[PDB]
DNA sequence: CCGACGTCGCATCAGC
DNA sequence: GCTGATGCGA
DNA sequence: GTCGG
């Protein structure tokens, strides 16, 4: 990519601020700047050129000038040398280990993959599965495998109840040639914003996917959100496929458009779009778009009959999913 | 300057 | 048990 | 760390 050196540097700084500094707004700020630079269609020649972009300020402009001149950032070169920062950054790569647990583990002398495997009984369930599949979860999924997985989930969901609709969202719906995981939005006419006429709607689907050995593990599970692990079947004498992360979100059927907007993302796109809604006097979540009175209090949900209706309310031209990869 | 920064589901814990 | 943070995640 | 009133 045109400015990959810069965007990698800013991403590394973002991860430092999240995992080590525990400064979520600096993390979001660095990621917003990396994102706007990533889509900028010129090779950046100076910090001042970058500072014209929204989300790039004085400090990041100075880092860009240092990086352009020397190929590196002294602030990062030092962070890379700090053992405590290095340990925390590694531990947070395990699903279920966040910044707080990573610093506590380091305090307790658990700092390496070997240390984690020796101390399984100090991990909660989520973290224990994250460790089991540590290597697998850092591999990406070719779109060809995403298509095979789509076929399994959609056909198995149909076998439970033909009135279910499952929609693969996330980076897949944005047309990516590879995905970090699989994200599945689920609806059923029994579950609306007005009533739940049938229990176990998510459970029935998860159970079926476990029974055909597609879902292999569970990280967390409630009435509307499943977070877990899945795996494609391999043929005779084939090496097994990597285990993959899968998220399933059951959304009230009448709120599908807000749900699919949320679950298509990207995460940075949603933050930018929701922030723009706020400036326009609206609030968006995965269920509704609601006005804000002078109150600052959300009003009643507005009618939504398409994804584009949501963009229209906030005076944005419609963006196809493939153009939301921020 | 300085308050705001997207929004919410599930797991875990503390305090009653 | 319930409720309200807090952590971690989408 | 950046933005906007
Ligand atoms: N902090 C976050 C994280 C995620 N999401 C949303 C939008 C995402 O696109 C979606 C799925 O989360 P993923 O982490 O799976 O992100 P992607 O599917 O977009 O990318 P990847 O290829 O890494 O899975 O849920 C969000 O709104 N806010
Ligand atoms: N998971 C899904 C996907 C689509 N739908 C509905 C919402 C729309 O009325 C209709 C249009 O589908 P599509 O967006 O795939 O064109 O399908 C649903 O209820 N649940
Ligand atoms: Cl909707
Ligand atoms: Cl709502
Ligand atoms: Mg995904
Ligand atoms: Mg603002
Ligand atoms: Na700027
Ligand atoms: Na983690
Ligand atoms: Na996901």
Spatial CA neighbour of A77 closest among A68, A67, A62, A92: A67
Are A22 and A118 found together in one domain? no
Work out how many domains chain A is built from and give that number: 4
Are A158 and A230 found together in one domain? yes
A113 CA, B6 C1': Å apart? 34
Spatial CA neighbour of A228 closest among A212, A254, A210, A252: A210
Spatial CA neighbour of A95 closest among A246, A213, A210: A246
Element (H, E) at A13: helix A4-16
Sign of CA dihedral A217, A222, A224, A227: negative
Are A256 and A152 found together in one domain? yes
Distance between CA atoms of residues A246 and A251, nearest Å? 16
Are A251 and A267 found together in one domain? no
Beta-bridge mates of residue A182: A246
Beta-bridge mates of residue A184: A168, A248
Q: DSSP label at A316?
A: P
CATH number at residue A188: 3.30.460.10
- Those residues whose C-beta lies under 8 Å from the C-beta of residue A64, and which sit 6 or more positions away, are A6, A44, A46, A47, A50, A56
Are A19 and A76 found together in one domain? yes
Are A147 and A254 found together in one domain? yes
Give chain A's end-to-end CA distance (angstroms, integer).
14
| Cα–chain center distance at A76 | 25
Are A231 and A184 found together in one domain? yes
Collapsed DSSP state (helix, strand, coil) of residue A186: strand
Per the residue annotation, which of A18, A63, A111, A253 is the catalytic one?
A: A63
Experimental method reported for this structure: X-ray
Are A30 and A55 found together in one domain? yes
Are A229 and A281 found together in one domain? no
**Read out DSSP for A99-164?**
HHHHHHHHHTT--SHHHHHHTGGGS-HHHHHHHHTHHHHTS-EEHHHHHHHHHHHHHHHHHH-TT-
Are A52 and A31 found together in one domain? yes
Closest approach atom of ligand 1 to CA A178 = 22
Contact A313, A278 (CB under 8 A): no
The residue nearest atom 6 of ligand 2, judged by CA position, is: A256
Tokens encoding A121? 């009984």
| Residues in the annotated binding site of A for Mg(2+) | 181, 183, 247
Are A249 and A271 found together in one domain? no
Collapsed DSSP state (helix, strand, coil) of residue A82: coil
Please state the three-class secondary structure of A187-250 as a single string. Answer: ECCCECCCCECCCCHHHHHHHHHHHCCCEEEEEEECCCEEEEEECCCCCCCCCCCCCEEEEEEE
Of A14, A137, A170, the one to substitute when testing ligand 1's pocket (max ligand atoms within 8 A of C-beta) is A170
Contact A22, A99 (CB under 8 A): yes
The distance between the two most distant Cα atoms of chain A, rounded to a whole number of Å, is 66
A302 CA, B6 C1': Å apart? 18
User: Do strands A182-187 and A215-221 pair parallel, antiparallel, or not at all (unpaired)?
Assistant: unpaired
Beta-bridge mates of residue A226: A221, A248
End of a domain among A262, A294, A314? A262
CATH number at residue A21: 1.10.150.110
Q: Is the peptide bond before A266 cis (omega within 30 degrees of 0)?
A: yes
Contact A284, A258 (CB under 8 A): yes
Domain of A35 in residue numbering reads as 3-82
Are A115 and A207 found together in one domain? no
Query: Per-residue b/e over A43-54, b at no fewer than 16 CB within 10 Å?
Result: ebeebebbbebe
**Checking phi first, is residue A235 left (phi over 0); if not, alpha (psi -120 to 50) or beta?**
beta
Distance between CA atoms of residues A258 and A260, nearest Å? 6
Distance between CA atoms of residues A304 and A285, nearest Å? 13
Spatial CA neighbour of A53 closest among A70, A68, A38: A38
């Amino acid at each position: 990519t045109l400015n990959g050196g810069i965007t990698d540097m800013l991403t590394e700084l973002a991860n430092f601020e999240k995992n080590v500094s525990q400064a979520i707004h600096k993390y979001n700020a660095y990621r917003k700047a990396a994102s706007v630079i990533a889509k900028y269609p010129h090779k950046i020649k100076s910090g001042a050129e970058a500072k014209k972009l929204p989300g790039v300020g004085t400090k990041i402009l100075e880092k860009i000038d240092e990086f352009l001149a020397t190929g590196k950032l002294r602030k990062l070169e030092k962070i890379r040398q700090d053992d405590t920062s290095s340990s925390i950054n590694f531990l947070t790569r395990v699903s279920g280990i966040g910044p707080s647990a990573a610093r506590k583990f380091v305090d307790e002398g658990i700092k390496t993959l070997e240390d984690l495997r020796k101390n399984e009984d100090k991990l909660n369930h989520h973290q224990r599965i994250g460790l089991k599949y540590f290597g697998d979860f850092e591999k990406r999924i070719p779109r060809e495998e995403m298509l095979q997985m789509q076929d399994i989930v959609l056909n198995e969901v149909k076998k439970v109840d033909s009135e279910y609709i499952a929609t693969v969202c996330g980076s897949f719906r944005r047309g990516a040639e590879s995905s970090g995981d699989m994200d599945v939005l689920l609806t059923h006419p029994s579950f609306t914003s007005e009533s739940t006429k049938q229990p176990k709607l998510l459970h029935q689907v998860v159970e079926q996917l476990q029974k055909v050995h597609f879902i292999t593990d569970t990280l967390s599970k409630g009435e509307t959100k499943f977070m877990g692990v899945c795996q494609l079947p391999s043929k005779n004498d084939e090496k097994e496929y990597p285990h993959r992360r899968i998220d399933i979100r059951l959304i009230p059927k009448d709120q599908y458009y807000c749900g699919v907007l949320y679950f298509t993302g990207s995460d940075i796109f949603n933050k930018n779009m929701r922030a723009h809604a706020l400036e326009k006097g609206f609030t968006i979540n995965e269920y509704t778009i609601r006005p804000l009175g002078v109150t600052g209090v959300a009003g009643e949900p507005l009618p939504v009959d398409s994804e584009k209706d949501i963009f229209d309310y906030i005076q944005w031209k419609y963006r196809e999913p493939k153009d939301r990869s921020e």
